[PDB]
Design a protein around this ligand. Structure first.
Ligand code: AMP
Ligand code: ZN
Length: 344
């Protein structure tokens, strides 16, 4: 009366494998195993570590002969990295004679806040703001298969920009932007507010490439290291970056009011979404808000597994064993591409 899912994420630099326990359809699934091997070349890393990782996962999950579904990121991303997990997933599927689902990567980010409350919250339609180190997108979700991008970044992601500006202040570490928030919060009022920093179609867009450039052209009028000044500058940096996002979100909500007539829930996921100041400006300068945890907003295979559970039960669809990776996969063309198949 229940089943288990083997999930593989291989679109990014980190290799991710998970085992989910869908013990009941009237309850949120549980995680039996969730591993990430960080790249610390892209196609080789997955190719060399996808094997030992899953083996380790099946041992820890204690269910090598109990998984009933294989979910793997089909795209988008680099063909070399995607293949490493996709070809491997097929091997698992053929050996176990079990169904396979080629999952869209962005679909995982959008659907993962539902998993906690099964499929209840949030409900369609809902809007989502994916703000990570690789994504900066605003998406409308009308259905499990109907997703529309309303605003996407042009150059880099917000996380990529904040880190780049964080290393110029300069902070170090795995996640630089997260560290930059701390030094500015320790002196949230204790920082000397003396510096007045200077920061800056047929489809609305984000942009973050100029923030590092504008940052360099302001430290050139001052000096490059007073913590009362450091915490002050860092505040104005993240503020203006968040200002750009809120401004573009406003433009979207004002341009297409008909799109947003029946949505009452805003989802902000991605690594950057853990930023309290960002969370605050969203709720202030804009209808519920949902903030997914940190261990799910970052790239992982759990969201891939849950996404597969979504499409297997709701759409009753499955992927053919001949599916190839997709470099550029438009979210609106989710079911347009070969080759989906029904179990219904
Ligand atoms: N609390 C935070 N505030 C701002 N940025 C963050 C925070 N936590 C993580 N990040 C950034 O999010 C990115 C990683 O998220 P992800 O790409 O989802 O793995 C990195 O650029 C981090 O610096
Ligand atoms: Zn991602």
């Amino acid at each position: 009366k229940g089943y288990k899912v083997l999930a593989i994420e291989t679109s990014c630099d980190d290799t991710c494998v998970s085992v989910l326990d869908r013990f009941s359809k009237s309850a949120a699934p549980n995680v039996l195993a969730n591993l990430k091997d960080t790249l610390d070349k892209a196609h080789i890393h997955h190719q060399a570590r996808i094997g030992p990782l899953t083996e380790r996962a099946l041992i820890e999950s204690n269910a090598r002969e109990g998984i009933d579904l294989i979910c793997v990121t089909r795209g988008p991303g680099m063909p070399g990295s995607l293949s490493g997990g996709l070809d491997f997933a097929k091997g698992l599927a053929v050996a176990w004679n079990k169904p396979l689902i080629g999952v869209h990567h962005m679909l995982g980010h959008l659907l993962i806040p539902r998993m906690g409350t099964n499929g209840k919250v949030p409900q369609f339609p809902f809007v989502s703001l994916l703000v990570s180190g690789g994504h900066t997108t605003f998406v409308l979700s009308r259905a499990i298969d109907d997703h529309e991008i309303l605003c996407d970044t042009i150059d880099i992601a917000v996380g990529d920009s904040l880190d780049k500006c964080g290393r110029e202040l300069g902070f170090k570490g795995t996640m630089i932007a997260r560290e930059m928030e701390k030094f500015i919060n320790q002196d949230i009022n204790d920082q000397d507010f003396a510096l007045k920093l200077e920061m800056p179609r047929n489809m609305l867009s984000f942009s973050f490439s100029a923030f590092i450039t504008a940052l360099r052209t302001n430290l050139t009028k001052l000096g490059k290291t007073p913590e009362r000044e450091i915490r002050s500058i860092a505040y104005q940096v993240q503020e203006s970056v968040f200002d750009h996002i809120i401004n573009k979100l406003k433009h979207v909500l004002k341009s297409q009011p008909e799109k947003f007539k029946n949505v009452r829930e805003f989802v902000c996921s991605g690594g950057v979404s853990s930023n309290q100041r960002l969370r605050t400006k969203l709720e202030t300068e804009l209808f519920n808000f949902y903030y997914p945890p940190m261990d799910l907003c970052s790239d992982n295979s759990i969201m891939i597994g849950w996404a597969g559970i979504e499409i297997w039960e709701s759409l009753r669809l499955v992927s053919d064993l001949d599916i190839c990776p997709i470099r550029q996969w438009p979210l609106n063309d989710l079911l347009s591409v070969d080759g989906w198949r029904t179990d219904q």
